[model samples]
Target chain A: NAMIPAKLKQGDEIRIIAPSRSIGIMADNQVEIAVNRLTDMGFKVTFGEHVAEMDCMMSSSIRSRVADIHEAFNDSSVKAILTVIGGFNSNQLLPYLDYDLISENPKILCGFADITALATAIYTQTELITYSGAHFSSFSMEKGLDYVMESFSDCLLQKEPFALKESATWSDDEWYLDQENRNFIPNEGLVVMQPGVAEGIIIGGNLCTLNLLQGTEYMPNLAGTILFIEDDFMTIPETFDRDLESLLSQPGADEIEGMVIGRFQQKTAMTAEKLAYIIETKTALQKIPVISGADFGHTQPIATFPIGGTARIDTNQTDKIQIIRH
Target chain B: NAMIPAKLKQGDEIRIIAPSRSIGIMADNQVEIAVNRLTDMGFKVTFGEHVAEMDCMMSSSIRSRVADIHEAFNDSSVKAILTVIGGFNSNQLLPYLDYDLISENPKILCGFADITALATAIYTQTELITYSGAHFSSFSMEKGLDYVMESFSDCLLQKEPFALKESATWSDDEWYLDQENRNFIPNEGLVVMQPGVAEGIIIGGNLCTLNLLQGTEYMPNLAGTILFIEDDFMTIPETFDRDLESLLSQPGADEIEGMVIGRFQQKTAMTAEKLAYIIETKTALQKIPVISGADFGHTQPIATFPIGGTARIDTNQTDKIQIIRH
Candidate 1:
């Protein structure tokens, strides 16, 4: 099985790049805090030159963002690169990225949200192992999550396989750490429809952002993967239906083992039942494990997964999901 | 030639619906102001039941929103139905709409921005003419545009042929009307892409939104029509290249005579020169008159065309556009 072999040790360097959306130079304090956090974890950190300059769009300009990725890949000391944040148009950066260079480096690139662009692109073009985990916000935020620290320690520092269990409490709102903490209810996963079983490499995040890659080369070959889809907010049924149809019509619709759907937080567009109906109708799919209420997406206390890594899913085996981090 | 005879006489009733996105219901005073203003224009006003309901996903919830539209259409006393605003999923209302009813009793429907959904859907599904003119912000705004009132009067009430002109200026930021007024710019005509000359019905608005309908029955025949397309902030290369590709790939790509490309307000994602290069590379459309900077889309001082109405586009003439509105 193809797996990332590099291991992380304390004092190892992690490079930060804006491969998809560029967040040009950070404020002095922001850089300090970010570096401090990584250093506190006993990891060295480096920033790409274009990380601070505003190039274009809401995220960093496309050229600079792609350049940052290329720069980080070539830097031998840089162990892993983290993203500043995610935004709408990261899919546009695919053509700009040097896929061959990325394939050559084959380093762990971590991000979430729209970062699916880079993660999926690397997987498709290079088959390089990447993780859509830990965001810059997790470290720079006034109050960071303990799971974040623990997960970083396990996945990046230790480079070991880790089991992600659901939090007992959750909150969608920001946490100051000092404020009253919201305890997350344990999510055993909602089987909106009857449960079934399946397995494949996990590949998807933030459906709206994912949909942007429909016709692009950066889109992963969904051929035989467990396509994980979720959105922060609910989308209208028509658009949602259309997106699902496009996904099905794309290269790998028939072979999908099952889908892990994330809960739509406060979706006013369509009811969850109606959304499920549309999904089922469009896909002409059923009797599969259609799990909903994933701890992923814009929710609280998410059980972090290496989004593009290998995973064995058994809806029947609800006891624990088997995720292999090689 | 078929046209919706003006049913809105002085003192007829009007109402608003949140067909696509949820908006905060205005305070009583604001509603009173709106009611008084409509009454002053010779129409009484009523708000839809769901108009005040918060948490509408950009107006995508099909059940209640469809109900609101149906109520307005069914009510003979309510001469017209307008939207409070447009949002992302407004297009979802099409499936639930009674095309027969909309076609049978044509009441004036109007709004822009995301409102393009309501306008285009009615035009495509029912062949019922609707306006792509001023919207809630243009009217309910503090110190609304005088021509917004005039556009409504000419197109809906007075039944006069209104000239679609360019606005003198446009801005995304709302300037208190007293500080700066929004106006229009006059455009010559839809320029021909293949050259020679052909005339057909005018259709299309907001390029990205319309793309969602491609390959679906929802897409109307594009053959022999003057295709009018514009966007708010798509980079230049993406803008031209995407349309060019859509035209190239769709069955009716070659059937059009001219293209009316609207003015792009912000700096495009790509430069105009790069845009031209991308389009030129994709199609053999050398002799075609590709008109850019037309007074439409998210630009100010814009002209509203009766999309789907009988219109003649002459790229050769270059000086003026001719429309035959019966």
Candidate 2:
């Protein structure tokens, strides 16, 4: 039932929308850079009406945000919808979302961090495959745009299975303030928390954000899912562990085939050892291929991945993770 | 089907357990103060085995924590169970909890913050009423312990309806570190967000913490419920808004008859105007009674309230909120 959007071509139009927090006036320069980058890639770019409209808590009214999303799907010219940035309240739009419109127009790729709540809802309500990486603003990255763009292209422009390898460098610094002078730390590569192979449809996004979907209609069924979860710098180890435990306590958790944990922010004390202990003791990931420190999440140079798409994980292989798009 | 516990008598025994986070070594003095205060109230107090044992993230192993809760319920002499403190992971113990054991011994009152997950779960799983006010450590409050104790006594010992009045003073400061010299701010009185009257069973606890129960079997039916929700100083306005929206998105949210918001931490910038806007716009609380800035939550002098018991809200009356315990 997974419905994949047509692969993007040179002339495809990408619409940027702010479904969570608004793009503040301060971030206008970075927003401009991102739009230019998208245009430079031989694509047409547009912005939602309320993308820059800040009302409360840096987010526009929900009605305005929902209107933009409805317009993105209803307009046939728009090939994909990219979020301006992640914020804390995307889940607020779930009840008001036009799911029927989204289901009928099943191929417009959608995603970002808080957008994970929306994307997961779309996939759960309908079987549309959605992307989960690099907000449009991420294109403004001066140092790691190449890897990000490459992953974006590979994930959205081609339908084949793509192996996500370790990035040569990564960063969790405040690059938005000084993108040109941002420091990129060398990648430490993926950590094999448990060794085995498993295949299932990939599901999940920003850990704490995804928990917001719980007890609601938007929560995706985790049965037979290759859970791909990550968190931002604001998340502490305690918060992360509890969020994971809450998710696992949900109905189809034991059926989860495997898990892919994105790299933690360097400022956090979430070491591989601590994560391993949490995974082994707290979750049912007894023998599955559970890998950590993957090139995704809030870290710079994030790779795009598909939610509600088939994915395989093998610790024994050269490439630890392979995501298959339909 | 709501089940009310036997009214606590003067000689009843209360056991303290660390069902979520452990009472760290530093809180031992406060723990002693709390125990002495309870003893002075004409009740014998006992501590759980893992109360002093700190494991990962300041909480003991799940096995140990679960054992403490189970032991409290199984011990016939114990009439109530008080949580040592609220932490991020109490929902982790839901799947492993002995609901059957708890249901059979339903007279034992339970209460705490993140413990809202457990308390609501117990009420949902069984019809047993549970308290959602002060924790055992709340007794260590340098100021307002009298209000806490009085409310506790009324909620637990009396079977009649009682109106919860605003506290004359409250404190959300870090009194735990230096309890002897903490500042107590003058109460601003309750803000009647929307004026009306409604009656239903009361339910809810920490706003963000209750989210952990969503999408799980532990989530209680909010229908015909007078939802009483609160949050700690750690929550931002965005987080508070989203958490409430997420809960409202769940089934039966529209059936909620009334809402009583606990006093927000002064530092969170969650003003009465902002809360009113959120309640009016984000929820289905069009005309139902909505009150904010009540004495509960992380603030000292929190009034104890029943979770599964019937309650009424009347904005037209001098005493706005009343809880009917039987």
Candidate 3:
């Protein structure tokens, strides 16, 4: 029942919205750069009306945010919706969202980090596949954004399956403020914790962000899902472990096909050894193809992927991750 | 279906366990002070065998923590159980918990903060009532521990319905390390938001902590429940708002009878006016008897209340909070 939006064409229009934090006012220059980049790629760019209005911690009122989303969906010209950035409050809009309107509109690419709340809810309520990748601000990176752009094109512009490879460099630094001096560390590639192959629809986003959907109608059914989870710099090892435990404790957790863990922040102390131990001892992820330190999450040069889209993980062989768009 | 635990009597035995963070090793002096205080109240106190051991971010291994809890519950000599302090990982112990064993050996009081995961789980899985209040470390306060002690005595040693009055003073100061010079803020009493009268079983604990129970079998049903929620100093206003939204988005949320917000830390910026606005606009808690700044949560001198006990909010009258042990 996964509904894949039509692949973006050269002249497709992309709507930028702020579903979480109000980066519209905070990072106007970066946002402008992002819009210009999208336009340079032969795509038409537009912004939601309330994208620039700051209301407390959010970009605007929930009603305004919801209206913007609905407007995007209802507009036939809009090909995709990109979030301004990730924040901690998108879950607040779940109850007020018009699921019927979204279901009726059907295929429209929607995405970002804290947008996990929105993406997962859309998939749960309407079975519409959404992207779990770069926000509009992510595109605003002054340098080292080539890999992200390539991944975005691969995932959204083509309907065929594509392999996600390691980036030559990655970073967890705040490059938006001073993009020229941003530190990019050498990439170590994906770490295969347990070697095997597994396939299922990819589900999940920022680990802590995903937890916001739990116990609500928005929580996606994890049965036969290949979980893709990551976290930000603020996540400590303890919090990460507990959050994983919370997800695994769900009724359908044992049925999860595999897992893909995105790279952790350098300051987080979440080493490959520690992550492997946590997965092995603390969770039911015993023999599955559990990969870690991938090119995603809070790190720069992140690759775009689809949530509710079919994905295969083959750790039995190196450099193997296939995302099959439906 | 509510199961009220037997009230503690003089010379009763209480077992201290660190189900989340290991306070046994980190706060040995505080633990000692707590034990002495308990003993001075004519109670015999004991510590879980793994209480002093520190594992990665936890008191000990989950197996050991579960074993300690099971042992305490099985021990007929033990009259109650107390957590050393609150931490972020209590949800890790939920799936491994012995619910059958706990249900069979029912009438023992279990209490504290991140312990919300355990308390709410026990109330959901079994009908056992659990206390939500001060941890053992709360007693280590060199000063201003009288209100907490009195609240504990009123809730645990007596069965009569009691009204909770505002404490004359409260503190969010780090008194555990240097209890001598801790600052206690002047009490402003309870701020009645939307006023009315409502009665139901009281449920809920740390707002963010309770979210750890979502999508898991341990989540308590909030239907017809008088929700009592609070958060620690680490929580920002944005996080608190989203966490509240997460809880309200769950099924049966509209059935919530009333809400009592525990006093927020001074630095959280969660003013009474903001809280009232959130309740009125963002949630289904419209027109319900809602009160904020109650003597509970991260602050010292927290009032002890039952998680499954019947409670009444009579905001129609001034000084209107009542808890009845059934």
Candidate 4:
């Protein structure tokens, strides 16, 4: 594909746009620090005109956000696009994005959380690969920054395959240095379950984010994709139930071989037993391999998992996860 | 609409199915009561063979639920369909519902909460009206039978416009009924925010329910519809923000004429003030009238609001909510 050949380089210009809710802190330093970080990485940074405009919790009005995304893709100087934040309303940008332009200019577009709407939409409708990790505000932290730096550099610049390992410990506390520091965390490694082997294209992000794409034009045909799902601090059962129900109802239910279930850092109404029950009941011996409770989502020691990339999963009797990439 | 002529009536046969999450409580009494209620109301109630089946939280396996829905809808004698209870996966039933049969039969379906998915889908895709209030379990409450009776008699049987006026005084205490055997209170009338006089079709049911339909084929066009939104309890900001964002992002934003905001019963992170602030910020011009704290949702002295029906909004002198069926 054209995207594979035109690998991103050190001085590539990365454009950040807030297509749904803006990453707002009521402080200008947050924006400054994000731009500075991008610049320090040997990349030219350009903020969409509507990045700082706050309409409610959104960075700009829907019209402007949609326009900003369009402008980012249309702008020749913008080699890659990164999202500043994620929220509930990014799905609204579906009508606004130029799918044709995005399909033609498929490059490294990295984001997670709510931004999954855009990423999945682009992937499904346009066959453009997008990342589901690391944004500006959250990148203020150390581990988050490390993941971002590594994932962005390797995935975009180097165009190399990377394995996602789980983190040993996770924390939610943001260490705000001088009220401008973006929170970060280092990843430990991948959490392996069932100790088996599998390989497929990586194709999932936040469970809820992927859900927003359901029944829309953006839903990809996940026939043979290795789905990697993550969630924040929701109870294990709630996350399990919601994700299971959604995936089962989706267009590509029977085809996927193995799943890398991300961690449920925040517990809502679900207990560990309930999470186990979900995996056992939903995917068990449907003849498909199942793994559960990996380190992802709102946790530290977080691995920068490859988004929409090829992955080879090797599980041992000890339930240790090892990944190989193309 | 053909649905107007094929109205639901006593002696009509109905079917109860569990097409999503498994029925809660695991007790048969709830289903028994619902069956008896429908039978006593003069309708023959046929229970799906898999109604009691459990696959984790899902009432039955996906295929089972889909088969049940299909059987119920296609059954010649089944004039209306009712869910055994609302659970997490009803949205998953979308692919399984026989749209051709549903559109052809145009049966009167009733239930609320998670069932909103099925209800909205049938209503929008088939132009068939569906009910939002009352479920079998809630109807079995000692004094709660009245809401169920009123919801059916006036909304379904009568085929006339009705007003669900709020009571002057309401209580959260369910025991008040056990002590006093009071089923309902007097009409308190609708509370209007920006007082004015206007009218439009009454659309919208459960908030989260409506959200699940976004970008789906089940989404009803809200153009020129007077949207009526109600919620049990949501954290203040999220409740207000999500709802407002949905309205703003709905297919045609400018088409909304007026909104009747129901009174949220519980006090949570989303307080009345936060809701009001969201309204103020999201709808600055107040071009479309919005009245907050209306009586509906998990509140007492509630009235039955019509779904897929017409209504007149007289916010001028008083916010008198009168349903208009034309």
Candidate 5:
């Protein structure tokens, strides 16, 4: 039941839609930088009609946002779709979505954080593999573009199996507020909480946003999935633990093959010690190959992965993570 | 399928348990004030064995908290259980709880905020009505004791039906920290978002806390329920809307007869304009009797109601909310 969309090639059109927050939150220079970056990568970037619209909540109206999504999928030339940014209300568009239209014409849909709801819901509703990675505005980062571009290309521009290696350094600065003076922290590679080998379908994104799908028809089955979840600065160890506890109690949770956790923002005060304590407390994850400190989440230089695609995670073999199908 | 526990009498023993936060966070003076207030009301209060044990999270360990709860339920002389206070980790103890013990020794278990998870889960697991009300610490507030005691007596001390009337005034002050000086605002009574009369089972407390039980086995069936949901100062309009959107997407949500929302704390910046926009946007609430600005929440003089009991709500009839069964 898994269907992969065609990967992007040279001159392919990538449509930017604001399913969460609108581009009106962006500066003119940031938009120019993003467009130039994508154009330099041999892709034509196009904007949805309502991408620049803004409301009191910093998001466009539901009708306008859903219309933009429907138009992006219906347009045959649009080979990929990326969200403008992440906010707190993308789940508001779920019941209004046209799943039949999305299923009939599948293409790459990618964004992180609040986009988890939009991307994951589309994947569950259509059995199409969506992505949890860079938003269109992510390209505005002038300093961290090297690792992000390499990861984006490996996932969206090629079909071969690819390994998502760690970035040399990561940042949790206010890049949008001041792009020039960014703070970079030395990277620590993946932390293996438990060791084993398992390959399963990829599931999960920004943790709490994904929690919004629980008990809803949009929630994906967890029976044989390797879940990779992360949270932003707004989340603490306590909040993350509670959210994870809820997700672990789902119907298909007992049969999960493995678990992968994304690196958290520095402000969240998450350490290897706290993460281990939280993971060890969960009964469903005790025997699985649980790992953390992956190169994704609210940090800079993020990596993308298919929401419904298959992945081979071999923690015993030097904590390797390979995206085999997308 | 519903079961009502015996109400509190003048001489009954009340067990104070730290199922959420520990009593270590409370000052000796505050505990004394609460004990004096309850004692003056003609009840005897006792402490749990591990109520003051503190952990890194400012809450007691799961095993300790669970043991205290088991002991509370096991003691036949304990007519009621009042949480020391509400914190973030009460849901962690849900899986470890002896629900059968609670069912066999049915009695009032009450608290608010994070306590919503524990109270609601016990109600769902055993069909015994639990409460969303004040914590033991809440009784320590000096000025608002009259209204809180009145509501507590109405819900727990008597077998007759009672109406939850609006408090004459409400305060968002640090009353515990400074008892003499307080900031109180005149109560703006219930605002009927969609006026109508409806009667159904009560099925909500703190909205985001209840969302934790969505896909878990502890979640109650929402069909034919009159939902009364609230949030603390930590929640803003957007977060509350997203949470409400998710709950409205649950399985039995379409069958909910009415929705009564508690007043938002001043810090939430939740104007009636934003509240109307959010409630009106939901497809599941279009035809239901929806009201807000009720006299329960993080504000002083909060009212208590039965989580799994029956209620008759009439928006047109003076916005009357009658707790018919508890």
Candidate 6:
């Protein structure tokens, strides 16, 4: 059975854990800003004991990460868990994660990027819906963060079904590096490649990261799912196609109801034509309600969504995404 | 039961196919060099009908690629199939491939990089021994090809058991661009991370490419497999570690007898220390006979090895790799 954690309430305790990258990678000012932001939102933010730990791999040891995660879930005071940041190698912690503990103490777990593997695995193994949205570090962003906060709060702080609408403007700059100088562009919202309304469970985050769970017991069934797929700037159209093709080869892939593609960074050079051609090659997706250029992925400001929750989409309509049971 | 194709011999017809990237990407001079070299080896080389076709993605349509592959395998005169080059998108052809046709008409199918998906899939679906070695384009290298020819011939042209020895020197230069100028470095044979003797069926090729087959029916059982894995310059130590971690998560991964890691390109920035650190993180690899710097992968003069064949490795000995069956 699918399980949804209690919605975040005012004064709720949010446990920050370094399940992917460590908090040590963050600057002291960034850390303060994130804490201040969370506090301003009427939430109490605390970090795991090993959040500051760092290693040559750019992240803490597996035991430390797993310990922090278990502790976050074990502590009843913690209303939600948010990752410190996103990086590679979170999948390494999959086998060591205590799924029973996670299942028993089901609570909101939110992060993105490399956290895709972690969140997706927890969802499949425990059937506890996990959030694919901003990390604890994302709060450090000062500019172009209104959409992120709005989407995140709407998704996590409120239990009512909500529509994921594109912001008036979006950005693709390194705002964390120079928050004062933000590059915002008009958000040309959803680009519908294939048109057909469908309602299904949401499954996926960072495309390649989610692919790590492919043959593992942690992989979720794609049948009756509307996948939320995205990748970072490092991905080219070719790699994105290859990775997506791999995902479509999984069991029940052909049964997917629809797909929601995240916006790509300029570095990936994923033009609309190229994206269309890539999707065209996948016969499994030729008839689905496929929409790209959504408000997610490795860009400034992202929308938060549930990893194993239900969503409905009607590409013919203006407001395409409907969070049905998140 | 497994299958091994008849060995290549004098006057054997080798079919050149563009299952990954189009042969149109190859320079005319380079194509001529490859054809001339194969003929020099007492082989008659023929091109796939659609090898020259190119599209916006720099690869031919799936229908055309599939048609060429079927034609190559179905032709009784086609004793072997060699890919033009390795690139993304080969996995897209997997579902469209005629596995039964390949099963009934088994022959040597050899290539590296993206061809890893094609060869491994054929091996898994049909139990036919494919190869993880030279592509037709690999023959275009003007220098440091003595070892490539030697290993290719020994593995495919001779039936006797053979040892895959490290080349005296290897190059990673763009010899095709400038034949007179090349960079050759003295080879460092093998770095034994874990010590033990193992003998098992061979499995694996380009690390990320092999990852594409993870959840599909075409995924070969890692049980009792001696994996030959590598990646190209596109990989970083972190991404490589992530990809390998995913593979280790597959079923039967724990039962793998050993692993022979191929040499990485200089651009990958993979050092012995980083690689050793990566391997140590995976407990699934700690006890097995694991060795790196093998004469395969993206480096010059790579050795050819059978995918469904058998190999033996002894970390205690200098001659670590023994190809028992191919």
Residue pairs with backbone atoms closer than 3 Å in model 2 (clashes): A215-B214, A215-B215
DockQ of predicted candidate 2: 0.71
- Docking quality class, candidate 1: incorrect
Docking category of candidate 2: medium
By lDDT, who's the top model here? 6
Taking all chains together, each candidate's TM-score versus the true structure is: 0.61, 0.97, 0.96, 0.72, 0.98, 0.98
TM-score result, candidate 2: 0.97
Q: What is the DockQ of candidate 5?
A: 0.81
Candidate 2 C-alpha error for residue B130, in Å:
1.2
Q: DockQ for each of the predicted structures, in order?
A: 0.09, 0.71, 0.72, 0.20, 0.81, 0.88
DockQ sort, best first = 6, 5, 3, 2, 4, 1
Please report how far candidate 6 places residue A123 from its true position, in Å: 1.0
Q: How well docked is model 1, in DockQ terms?
A: 0.09
Alpha-carbon local distance difference test for all models: 0.62, 0.83, 0.82, 0.63, 0.90, 0.91
| lDDT for each residue of candidate 3 in B1-326, tens digit (9 for 90 to 100) | 68888899999888888888787455657767887898898899898888777865555677988988899999999988988877867787887888899998976555667899888888899888888877776777778878888888888888888887789888888777777988878888888887888999888878888888888777877888898999987787777887888888777788888899888887887866667557766566975888888988887778898888888889766659988764
For candidate 6, what's the RMSD?
Answer: 1.2
Q: What TM value does chain A in model 4 reach?
A: 0.85
Off by over 4 Å in 3: none
Question: RMSD of candidate 1 to the true fold?
Answer: 8.3
Q: A194 in model 2: Cα distance from truth in Å? A: 1.4
Provide the DockQ value for model 4: 0.20
Per lDDT, what order, best first?
A: 6, 5, 2, 3, 4, 1
Task: Provide the RMSD of all predictions against the true structure, rounded to 1 decimal.
Answer: 8.3, 1.7, 1.7, 6.2, 1.3, 1.2
Residue A95 miss distance in model 1 (angstroms): 2.7
**Reference contacts recovered by each candidate, as fractions?**
0.04, 0.85, 0.91, 0.15, 0.78, 0.93
**Clashes found in each candidate (C-alpha, N, C closer than 3 A):** 33, 2, 1, 38, 0, 0
List where candidate 6 sits over 4 angstroms from the true fold.
Answer: none
Candidate 1 lDDT, B211-241, residue by residue in tens: 5554444566666676677766533554345
